[PDB]
Design a protein around this nucleic acid. Structure first.
Ligand code: K
Ligand code: MG
Ligand code: MG
Length: 98
RNA sequence: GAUCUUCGGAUCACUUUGGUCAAAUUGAAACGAUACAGAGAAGAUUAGCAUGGCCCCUGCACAAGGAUGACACUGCGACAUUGAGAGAAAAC
């Protein structure tokens, strides 16, 4: 059944994936791009577990009056994958248009 | 110096310099000519009025003229891709 349920997910989206307006196109493009995302590397879990042991005050997930979220400077790999993803999307657009 | 005053002094008047810049090749403009093309509307000849502004010229002009003054008048991708097949690859 599990294989059929996987096919049920396929057919449900296949009839749901088959231009109307910009408002709906926004969400469709966004989650289509999300489908190509590969999250959850070794950075996030270490960040969650390490400074929480010495969390004297405020939480790492607290954002009511946090200040360090202004100065989040990412690493090389993340911005590299960003440029590569945007380049791939541009390639897809230019191969689709003509 | 003039006036008094009494030979102590008092009156009267009191600070310039119009500077596109020191006697003209090298800090007031704008070009002649020769050589090239060489006069708007989808055949041909040709009326014009406009639109745009780091383009102006003549004019006292918010008239009007200067070739309808001249130049300009186009053109592209917030396209989602799936619709499918095939050989591969890694995968139903
Ligand atoms: K004419
Ligand atoms: Mg005129
Ligand atoms: Mg004109």
């Amino acid at each position: 059944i599990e294989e059929s349920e996987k096919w049920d997910q396929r057919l449900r989206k296949k009839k749901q994936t088959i231009f109307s307006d910009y408002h709906s196109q926004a969400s469709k493009d966004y989650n289509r791009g999300i489908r190509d995302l590969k999250p959850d590397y070794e950075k996030y879990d270490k960040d969650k577990k390490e400074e929480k042991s010495k969390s004297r005050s405020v939480a790492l997930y607290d954002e009511a009056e946090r200040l360090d979220w202004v100065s989040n400077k990412p690493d090389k790999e993340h911005v590299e994958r960003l440029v590569e993803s945007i380049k791939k999307q541009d390639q897809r657009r230019l191969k689709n248009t003509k």
